[PDB]
Write an enzyme that holds these catalytic residues in place. Sequence first.
Site, PDB file in Angstrom:
ATOM      1  N   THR A 144      28.631  53.635  20.380  1.00  0.00           N
ATOM      2  CA  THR A 144      27.594  52.629  20.602  1.00  0.00           C
ATOM      3  C   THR A 144      28.028  51.522  21.554  1.00  0.00           C
ATOM      4  O   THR A 144      29.142  51.009  21.460  1.00  0.00           O
ATOM      5  CB  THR A 144      27.170  51.976  19.280  1.00  0.00           C
ATOM      6  OG1 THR A 144      26.699  52.983  18.377  1.00  0.00           O
ATOM      7  CG2 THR A 144      26.068  50.957  19.508  1.00  0.00           C
TER       8      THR A 144
ATOM      9  N   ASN B 218      36.873  53.985   9.016  1.00  0.00           N
ATOM     10  CA  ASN B 218      36.982  53.114  10.182  1.00  0.00           C
ATOM     11  C   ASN B 218      36.216  51.808  10.044  1.00  0.00           C
ATOM     12  O   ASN B 218      35.165  51.748   9.404  1.00  0.00           O
ATOM     13  CB  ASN B 218      36.496  53.845  11.437  1.00  0.00           C
ATOM     14  CG  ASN B 218      35.004  53.685  11.666  1.00  0.00           C
ATOM     15  OD1 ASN B 218      34.559  52.717  12.287  1.00  0.00           O
ATOM     16  ND2 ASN B 218      34.222  54.637  11.168  1.00  0.00           N
TER      17      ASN B 218
ATOM     18  N   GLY C  48      33.941  48.126  14.468  1.00  0.00           N
ATOM     19  CA  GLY C  48      33.088  46.979  14.733  1.00  0.00           C
ATOM     20  C   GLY C  48      32.529  46.928  16.145  1.00  0.00           C
ATOM     21  O   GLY C  48      32.477  45.859  16.750  1.00  0.00           O
ATOM     22  N   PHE C  49      32.111  48.078  16.669  1.00  0.00           N
ATOM     23  CA  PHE C  49      31.469  48.149  17.982  1.00  0.00           C
ATOM     24  C   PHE C  49      32.350  47.616  19.117  1.00  0.00           C
ATOM     25  O   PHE C  49      31.900  46.820  19.939  1.00  0.00           O
ATOM     26  CB  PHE C  49      30.136  47.375  17.973  1.00  0.00           C
ATOM     27  CG  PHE C  49      28.998  48.092  17.293  1.00  0.00           C
ATOM     28  CD1 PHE C  49      29.083  49.433  16.949  1.00  0.00           C
ATOM     29  CD2 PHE C  49      27.823  47.413  17.021  1.00  0.00           C
ATOM     30  CE1 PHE C  49      28.025  50.073  16.336  1.00  0.00           C
ATOM     31  CE2 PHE C  49      26.765  48.046  16.409  1.00  0.00           C
ATOM     32  CZ  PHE C  49      26.865  49.382  16.065  1.00  0.00           C
TER      33      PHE C  49
ATOM     34  N   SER D  85      25.553  51.391  11.364  1.00  0.00           N
ATOM     35  CA  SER D  85      26.967  51.022  11.324  1.00  0.00           C
ATOM     36  C   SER D  85      27.244  50.114  10.128  1.00  0.00           C
ATOM     37  O   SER D  85      26.528  49.134   9.923  1.00  0.00           O
ATOM     38  CB  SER D  85      27.392  50.313  12.612  1.00  0.00           C
ATOM     39  OG  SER D  85      28.698  49.770  12.480  1.00  0.00           O
TER      40      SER D  85
ATOM     41  N   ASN E 107      30.009  48.401   9.847  1.00  0.00           N
ATOM     42  CA  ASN E 107      31.025  47.456  10.304  1.00  0.00           C
ATOM     43  C   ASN E 107      30.444  46.290  11.097  1.00  0.00           C
ATOM     44  O   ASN E 107      31.176  45.563  11.768  1.00  0.00           O
ATOM     45  CB  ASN E 107      32.063  48.191  11.147  1.00  0.00           C
ATOM     46  CG  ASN E 107      32.569  49.446  10.466  1.00  0.00           C
ATOM     47  OD1 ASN E 107      32.776  49.466   9.253  1.00  0.00           O
ATOM     48  ND2 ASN E 107      32.761  50.507  11.243  1.00  0.00           N
ATOM     49  N   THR E 108      29.127  46.131  11.025  1.00  0.00           N
ATOM     50  CA  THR E 108      28.443  44.969  11.581  1.00  0.00           C
ATOM     51  C   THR E 108      27.548  44.380  10.489  1.00  0.00           C
ATOM     52  O   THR E 108      26.519  44.969  10.156  1.00  0.00           O
ATOM     53  CB  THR E 108      27.604  45.335  12.821  1.00  0.00           C
ATOM     54  OG1 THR E 108      28.474  45.702  13.898  1.00  0.00           O
ATOM     55  CG2 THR E 108      26.738  44.155  13.266  1.00  0.00           C
TER      56      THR E 108
ATOM     57  N   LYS F 148      19.553  56.559  14.344  1.00  0.00           N
ATOM     58  CA  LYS F 148      20.618  57.019  13.466  1.00  0.00           C
ATOM     59  C   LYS F 148      20.561  56.255  12.154  1.00  0.00           C
ATOM     60  O   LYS F 148      20.515  55.025  12.143  1.00  0.00           O
ATOM     61  CB  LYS F 148      21.988  56.849  14.119  1.00  0.00           C
ATOM     62  CG  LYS F 148      23.097  57.542  13.346  1.00  0.00           C
ATOM     63  CD  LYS F 148      24.413  57.530  14.097  1.00  0.00           C
ATOM     64  CE  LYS F 148      25.361  58.579  13.544  1.00  0.00           C
ATOM     65  NZ  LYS F 148      26.698  58.530  14.183  1.00  0.00           N
TER      66      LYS F 148
ATOM     67  N   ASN G 167      25.084  58.548   9.611  1.00  0.00           N
ATOM     68  CA  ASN G 167      26.241  57.720   9.917  1.00  0.00           C
ATOM     69  C   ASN G 167      27.246  57.767   8.766  1.00  0.00           C
ATOM     70  O   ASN G 167      27.059  58.505   7.799  1.00  0.00           O
ATOM     71  CB  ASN G 167      25.795  56.281  10.193  1.00  0.00           C
ATOM     72  CG  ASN G 167      26.725  55.551  11.138  1.00  0.00           C
ATOM     73  OD1 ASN G 167      27.948  55.654  11.028  1.00  0.00           O
ATOM     74  ND2 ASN G 167      26.149  54.812  12.080  1.00  0.00           N
TER      75      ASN G 167
ATOM     76  N   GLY H 275      28.049  64.450  10.036  1.00  0.00           N
ATOM     77  CA  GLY H 275      28.717  64.370   8.777  1.00  0.00           C
ATOM     78  C   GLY H 275      29.384  65.588   8.228  1.00  0.00           C
ATOM     79  O   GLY H 275      28.781  66.476   7.700  1.00  0.00           O
TER      80      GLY H 275
END
Length: 374
Positions: free
Chosen positions: A88, A113, A116-117, A184, A186-187, A238, A267, A315
């Site tokens: 991304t 993971n 964080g983009f 995601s 991680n955001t 996604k 995801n 996945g």
Amino acid sequence: NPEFFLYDIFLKFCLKYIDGEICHDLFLLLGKYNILPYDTSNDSIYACTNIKHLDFINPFGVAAGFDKNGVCIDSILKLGFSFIEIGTITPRGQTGNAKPRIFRDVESRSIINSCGFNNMGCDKVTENLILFRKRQEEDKLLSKHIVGVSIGKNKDTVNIVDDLKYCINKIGRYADYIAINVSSPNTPGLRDNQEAGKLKNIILSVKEEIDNLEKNNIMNDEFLWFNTTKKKPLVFVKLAPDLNQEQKKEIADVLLETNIDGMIISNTTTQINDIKSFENKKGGVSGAKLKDISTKFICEMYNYTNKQIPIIASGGIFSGLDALEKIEAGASVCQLYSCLVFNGMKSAVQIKRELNHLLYQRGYYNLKEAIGRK
Ligand SMILES: Cc1cc2nc3c(=O)[nH]c(=O)nc-3n(C[C@H](O)[C@H](O)[C@H](O)COP(=O)(O)O)c2cc1C
Ligand SMILES: Cc1c(C(=O)Nc2cc(Cl)cc(Cl)c2)cccc1[N+](=O)[O-]
Ligand SMILES: CCCCCCCCCCCC[N+](C)(C)[O-]
Ligand SMILES: O=C(O)c1cc(=O)[nH]c(=O)[nH]1
């Protein structure tokens, strides 16, 4: 092929000693310099697939997050994949979270993971993609290969839509499809955008900017769409697997209402607590442990959407069997990530072979016949 074997050895070697993300960046560099092997074989005419008018020469591509900045598109594709989803990306360059931020668990064949983009930003990645497109024009092995672009928001962005709009106007012309990343983990607060209202508004804003690229332009489509399809990019969304039945129902309705071209399922997840090596680490989990969760998600959305919305599978896909499981579940195409991490360079040639032999045993005429059978 020897070349794959040597690389698989070098890969296994590097990972025993060196940090995971460092190894990733190294192999991206090898690919950037075109020192990686090629799969020059003809793909089975019975394993080709499509998502609406978007044609895939084979059913396997590389998921988002692998080549975030599109610095390695040629080499990854030439490993035998029909497509790659770069990103991304975000409008502005971004470092991501603190390293180390990627960890494997080998026995579980799972990954976690918290990247964080991290990416060079939309402008730089656009220039990279433009350079690829010019190479594609002159490379026999790159024709008919698809490149999608996953787009998202910067860490400190309040209005996600403004970020999505920006990316589309910058890189939309060079994309075969656009992947809206709202999944995601991680955001912070990004997944909140999967809410029906926000999501619906997000999809329509995205579709609107893409349509607007075509109108403001004066050139033929030949010169406007500098991509593979020579048409406007399709729009995918996604989704994260961490939703309840009701949330999934709500989203399914929005997809139909907005006439989304496809959905990427799915995801990474955060519901996996069974891996000891990951008990102290933050992030979303990938790999084998995500496969059943992802597959079930496919069956559900395939049902909720009345088989109307094409599905891109993500996945835990490692084997041809794993692939056929996604396909019989409702997926038209498969994406690999974890597979490359553990199987190495040969991932595409191996899994294509396995799937080809499996379609024959199960008495399928072609891949398209198997979609949504179970
Ligand atoms: C290090 C890493 C980075 C990722 N980055 C992205 C990303 O930027 N955008 C995205 O949509 N998915 C991203 N993903 C999720 C993968 O695209 C994929 O959906 C997920 O890993 C499940 O596939 P797999 O089980 O075959 O690995 C990332 C995954 C990992 C492990
Ligand atoms: C090793 C790794 C990889 C990885 O295997 N990357 C890779 C694998 C192959 Cl086979 C080719 C190329 Cl160009 C890259 C991808 C993401 C993360 C990690 N990791 O942190 O261990
Ligand atoms: C030790 C140097 C002498 C040999 C020169 C370098 C050999 C590289 C050629 C690799 C060709 C691989 N290919 C294209 C068949 O896949
Ligand atoms: O960039 C990331 O950290 C990331 C994005 C995403 O969509 N999924 C994931 O697992 N990580």
